[PDB]
């Protein structure tokens, strides 16, 4: 399979990263370092930027960088 | 001649030998079982619970607890309430 | 016999790596140089928490560590044990007995303890 | 990504040393050497499965056996290999069995 | 009576009180056997007491194959030491002997078809299922394995005194039905 | 189906003499007089021959055959060729406590003599023209 | 029918129970209906 | 006291998508479904070996008594029913072999044996011990042997039990040995294969039984048996 | 016809139930000896023909006189309803000569409908039409 399986691993990584207290946002390549997805496709990269991280109600953008949404959820 | 007394039927001892050679589905770690969970999800969008036990080869109660954390249920009135493998 | 089986292994290895070498652009000149080097290298205690009252309850652990003696690397079909003996249904496998290489397809093993 | 059982033999060690000479000479990448060992393991597994049609018998006394992840670790002492064409005497034999 | 049985297995539960990793033990044990498709535990045997052990992820330790209560406790202490050697906090919590089995002889053949007739509400003789007589009596909670050869196996007690009291009641019964 | 495939081919029918099974399970030939007395049914076992062929991949088409499979009992008309009283002399009929003058032609069900009245139907396969004045 | 009303069932299922209660009331009074089926009890005999 | 709805008779009984408006829905408890499916299995089980209806009625009495007392929670309904058929056969004075019942039911000998043990323990019902004479009429008529051969077989079997010559052997193994002597010492000869097939007794076990009952043969036979074959002419098996 | 069809239907679902889940099946215990046995013993006893099609076909033999036994074994029964006031199938038709008795007939509601064979009447047993059709196509 391709293009439909790596998104679950990415959203699981940054959610667990937010559980450790990482409030500061992270870039796309920084997340891809520890998820063992360095051979990911370029057409996947543009699809993540324009669809995946803007339709998800758990992702918010600060100066072009993506992070979790703790304000929407109850804390 | 027919209905001859036997200690055990031929089809029953063939099934018992197959069941004792194959054994029970083994309990596995959470990180590995998710990999064939995502690998199967990449092939087809929808799946029945009755078919995942024949793919990843895991205990039904274990598979039903692990997938409940990330997956959800959407009601379908056409055939059966089918489980969803999508985390969202 | 055994050298004839070894040359049949040589023909199978060099045939199976032709598609691998041409997949990543590796030239053919690597293969026969590898085979030449491959041939040359071959030819009343009421306080029960401490358990230090006993010692020397284990044998030498080095038998796994040395591996100097003969090592049998084979495959099994069925292994059963009853009252005294371990019996084995071993399919095809290989070993190294005193340098000489032996081969087998079926074997029945009996051991005691 | 295979059984990886014939690698710990004299044949496996000679091939591994041969690939080490090519790696130290900067001729091939270590990824190719892993692919060579992977294809060699598949080649030797098919060679013993097809062209071997002989049977041997052996007896001995066991001292150490272990089992995990479908791997056996039989160790036999005072082993007498009884074959129809030759008899082999040896003090100790270790058996590694997989499936 | 003058005849006393001798024990042949003893099973007992004790709690280590800590969780255990099965895979870590199985790679690093003297006598490890771990096939998850067959069973949920690792068996391990040692040669001097001839006992067998069943270690579990729950920390419950159960053993079998001993010949004495002191032998069974010392075998459990040896088994706890092996677990504790690999970095686990093995302890001894709630040691209790659960079942022992004993075998003995009477040295005369026994008429079974007359014994099942007089104790019909206590025994059941089914030579199609098993050639021995099952005798399920109440006072020491012991099942008996009575055979025409005279061998009797005493089974199911919590102490050795129950087996000794068991054969004291049954020996006059077996004496009256001697062939 | 559900892959293995099975075919159950049926074959020659075997029908025996009318037999009675007691409480012991011992078969015995049923007398027509005993059926009338003990309220039995005068029935004969019906045995079928079945050849079972398994179809599976791997060139392993095995043909097994079961001889004379019991598939129930059929009530038997008295004094027919398949009854017990077929081809018996008058002396042998009297020894069996059965009347020689009895014409037969009737079943024995639960000990009652049951006769099948010949039902009359309109003849089939034939074109008919009627005169419906309505 | 009373249980489905107090449990709030669907409209099609409560319509079938009313239609079946319609049949059972009428069959109690008249079991010689012109087109409707006739009630039977395990043996094929019409119910009087 | 539910009724049933008959077939439609006119246009008012059919909906416009080609189907009846009134459907024969019928209520029945899941417990009654289990009892009905077990009773429908018992009549199937009993009529395969041609049991009379009174054994079926005693089996259904035994099944209903156990099922309402409810001690057998986890064992299969076919296994417990097949065990109740075994007990009701034995309680009427004509018991059957476990292999005979296992040949009809889907349920193995080990499973019905465990069900037979658990029913007797959980019903407080005492049942008599079998003998060799109870397995005589069935095992002799199936092999097509005459009445005098039957009388000789049931005499040497009863004599061997009373004299206590073979402790601990199952009554099946001495019944088939009694058939083997009565057939080999008469005109109607029957080999060990045909006798063992009816008895389920292995062609090993019947020799194992025959190697000790042999050398006292003329004492077992009755004094008024027409010996078609002499005792000393029997084969040395 | 239908009783063997009913037996073959049930042995199909029984074998399908044991092969859907993979036990295979033993055929000798798949077939019950209960469908043919009950179906042919409930019929010929109750007089019902089905399993509402026909009724009153099998009767208890009138064992009162040897003349009565012979007359009952050779009886013809008409399917015309006895509550019908029509008289067209009750009259003695001209073609009943020699194979239906013109004299013997019961009285009352059944008159003319229950008939009896003559002395020499022989009802045809049936035969295959293949030899006749083979002869005709062989001919001109």
UniProtKB/TrEMBL annotation, chain G:
<comment type="function">
    <text>DNA-dependent RNA polymerase catalyzes the transcription of DNA into RNA using the four ribonucleoside triphosphates as substrates.</text>
</comment>
<comment type="function">
    <text>RNA-dependent RNA polymerase that catalyzes the extension of a non-coding RNA (ncRNA) at the 3'-end using the four ribonucleoside triphosphates as substrates. An internal ncRNA sequence near the 3'-end serves as a template in a single-round Pol II-mediated RNA polymerization reaction. May decrease the stability of ncRNAs that repress Pol II-mediated gene transcription.</text>
</comment>
<comment type="similarity">
    <text>Belongs to the RNA polymerase beta' chain family.</text>
</comment>
<protein>
    <recommendedName>
        <fullName>DNA-directed RNA polymerase subunit</fullName>
    </recommendedName>
</protein>
TrEMBL record, chain I:
<comment type="function">
    <text>DNA-dependent RNA polymerase catalyzes the transcription of DNA into RNA using the four ribonucleoside triphosphates as substrates.</text>
</comment>
<feature type="domain" description="RNA polymerase Rpb2">
    <location>
        <begin position="59"/>
        <end position="123"/>
    </location>
</feature>
<protein>
    <recommendedName>
        <fullName>DNA-directed RNA polymerase subunit beta</fullName>
    </recommendedName>
</protein>
<comment type="similarity">
    <text>Belongs to the RNA polymerase beta chain family.</text>
</comment>
<comment type="function">
    <text>RNA-dependent RNA polymerase that catalyzes the extension of a non-coding RNA (ncRNA) at the 3'-end using the four ribonucleoside triphosphates as substrates. An internal ncRNA sequence near the 3'-end serves as a template in a single-round Pol II-mediated RNA polymerization reaction. May decrease the stability of ncRNAs that repress Pol II-mediated gene transcription.</text>
</comment>
């Amino acid at each position: 399979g391709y293009k439909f399986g790596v998104l679950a691993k990415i959203v699981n990584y940054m959610k667990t990263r937010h559980q450790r207290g990482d409030t500061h946002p992270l870039t796309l390549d920084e997340i891809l370092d520890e998820t063992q997805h360095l051979d990911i496709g370029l057409k996947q990269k543009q699809w993540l930027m324009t669809e995946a991280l803007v339709n998800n109600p758990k992702i918010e953008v600060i100066d072009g960088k993506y992070a979790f949404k703790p304000k929407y959820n109850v804390r | 001649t027919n209905y001859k007394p036997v200690a055990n039927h031929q089809y029953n001892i063939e099934y018992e030998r197959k069941k004792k050679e194959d054994g029970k589905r083994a309990r596995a770690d959470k990180q590995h079982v998710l990999d064939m969970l995502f690998s199967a999800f990449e092939k087809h969008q929808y799946y029945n619970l009755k078919d995942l036990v024949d793919i990843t080869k895991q205990p039904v109660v274990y598979l039903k607890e692990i997938l409940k954390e990330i997956g959800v249920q959407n009601v379908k009135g056409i055939h059966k309430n089918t489980w969803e493998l999508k985390p969202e | 016999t055994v050298p004839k089986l070894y040359r049949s292994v040589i023909e199978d290895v060099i045939n199976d790596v032709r598609d691998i070498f041409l997949d990543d652009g590796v030239d053919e000149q690597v293969l026969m140089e590898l085979k030449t080097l491959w041939e040359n290298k071959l030819m009343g205690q009421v306080e029960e928490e401490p358990l230090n009252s006993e010692d020397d309850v284990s044998d030498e652990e080095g038998q796994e560590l040395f591996d100097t003696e003969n090592v049998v690397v084979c495959q099994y079909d069925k292994i059963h044990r009853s009252k005294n003996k371990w019996k084995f249904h071993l399919k095809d496998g290989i070993m190294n007995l005193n340098g000489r290489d032996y081969i087998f397809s079926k074997a029945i093993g009996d051991a005691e303890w | 990504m295979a059984y990886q059982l014939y690698r710990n033999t004299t044949l496996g060690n000679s091939l591994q040393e041969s690939l080490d000479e090519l790696i130290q000479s900067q001729q091939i990448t270590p990824q190719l050497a892993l692919q060579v060992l992977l294809q060699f393991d598949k080649a030797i597994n098919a060679a013993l499965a097809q062209r071997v049609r002989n049977r041997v018998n052996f007896r001995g006394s066991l001292n150490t056996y272990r089992f995990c992840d479908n791997v056996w670790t039989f160790v036999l002492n005072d082993v007498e290999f009884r074959e129809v064409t030759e008899l082999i005497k040896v003090d100790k034999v270790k058996i590694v069995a997989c499936d | 009576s003058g005849i006393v049985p001798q024990l042949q297995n003893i099973v007992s539960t004790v709690n280590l009180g800590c969780k255990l990793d099965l895979k870590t033990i199985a790679l690093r044990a003297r006598n490890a056997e771990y096939n998850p498709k067959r069973f949920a535990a690792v068996i391990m045997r040692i040669r001097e007491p001839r006992t067998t052990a069943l270690i579990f992820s729950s920390g419950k330790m159960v053993c079998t194959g001993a010949k004495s209560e002191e032998q069974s406790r010392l075998a459990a202490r040896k088994y706890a030491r092996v677990v504790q050697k690999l970095g686990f906090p093995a302890k001894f919590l709630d040691f209790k002997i659960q079942n022992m089995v004993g075998s003995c002889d009477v040295k005369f053949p026994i008429r079974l078809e007359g014994l099942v007739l007089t104790h019909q509400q206590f025994s059941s003789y089914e030579p199609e299922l098993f050639p021995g007589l099952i005798y399920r009596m109440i006072k020491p909670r012991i099942v008996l394995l009575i055979f025409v050869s005279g061998k009797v196996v005493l089974t199911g007690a919590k102490v050795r005194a129950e087996i000794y009291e068991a054969f004291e009641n049954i020996y006059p019964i077996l004496k009256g039905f001697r062939k | 189906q559900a892959p293995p495939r099975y075919l159950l081919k049926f074959e020659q029918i075997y029908l025996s003499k009318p037999t009675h099974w007691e409480r012991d399970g011992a078969p015995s030939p049923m007398m027509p007089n005993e059926a009338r007395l003990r309220n039995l049914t005068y029935s004969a076992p019906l045995y079928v021959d079945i050849t079972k062929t398994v179809i599976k991949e791997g060139e392993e088409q095995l043909q097994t055959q079961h001889q004379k499979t019991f598939i129930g009992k059929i009530p038997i008309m008295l004094r027919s060729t398949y009854c017990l009283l077929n081809g018996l002399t008058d002396r042998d009929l009297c020894e069996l406590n059965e009347c020689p003058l009895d014409p037969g032609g009737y079943f024995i069900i639960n000990g009652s003599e049951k006769v099948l009245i010949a039902q009359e139907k309109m003849a089939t396969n034939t074109v008919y023209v009627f005169a419906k004045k309505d | 029918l009373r249980r489905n009303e107090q449990n709030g069932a669907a409209a099609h299922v409560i319509a079938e129970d009313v239609k079946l209660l319609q049949f059972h009331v009428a069959t109690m009074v008249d079991n010689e209906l012109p087109g409707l089926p006739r009630a039977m009890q395990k043996s094929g005999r019409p119910l009087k | 006291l539910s009724t049933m709805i008959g077939k439609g008779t006119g246009a008012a009984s059919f909906d416009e998508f080609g189907n009846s408006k009134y459907q024969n829905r019928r209520t029945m408890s899941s417990s009654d479904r289990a009892m009905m499916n077990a009773f429908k299995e018992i009549t199937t089980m009993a009529d395969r070996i041609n049991l009379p209806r009174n054994i079926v009625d005693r089996t259904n009495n035994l099944f209903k008594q156990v099922y309402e007392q409810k001690s057998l929670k986890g064992r299969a309904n076919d296994a417990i029913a097949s065990a109740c058929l075994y007990i009701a056969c034995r309680q009427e004075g004509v018991p059957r072999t476990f292999k005979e019942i296992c040949a009809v039911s889907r349920i193995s000998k080990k499973e019905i044996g465990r069900c037979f043990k658990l029913i007797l323990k959980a019903l407080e019902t005492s049942v008599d011990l079998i003998t060799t004479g109870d397995f005589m009429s069935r095992f002799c008529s199936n092999l097509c042997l005459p009445k005098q051969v039957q009388m000789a077989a049931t005499h040497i079997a009863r004599k061997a039990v009373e004299l206590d010559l073979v402790p601990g052997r199952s009554p099946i193994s001495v019944a088939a040995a009694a058939i083997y002597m009565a057939s080999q010492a008469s005109a109607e000869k029957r080999t060990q294969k045909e006798i063992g097939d009816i008895a389920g007794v292995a062609d090993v076990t019947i020799r194992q039984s025959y190697r000790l009952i042999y050398p006292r043969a003329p004492d077992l036979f009755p004094t008024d048996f027409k010996f078609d074959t002499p005792v000393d002419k029997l084969p040395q098996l | 016809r239908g009783m063997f069809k009913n037996l073959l239907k049930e042995v199909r679902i029984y074998a399908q139930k044991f092969i859907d889940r993979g036990k295979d099946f033993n055929l000798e215990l798949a077939i019950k000896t209960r469908i043919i046995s009950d179906g042919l013993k409930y019929s010929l006893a109750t007089g019902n023909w089905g399993d509402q099609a026909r009724a009153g076909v099998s009767q208890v033999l009138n064992r009162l006189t040897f003349a009565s036994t012979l007359s009952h074994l050779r009886r013809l029964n008409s399917p015309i309803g006895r509550d019908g006031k029509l008289a067209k199938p009750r009259q003695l038709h001209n073609t009943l000569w020699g194979m239906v008795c013109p004299a013997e007939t019961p009285e009352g509601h059944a008159v003319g409908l229950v008939k009896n064979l003559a002395l020499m009447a022989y009802i045809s047993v049936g035969s295959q039409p293949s030899p006749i059709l083979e002869f005709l196509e062989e001919w001109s």
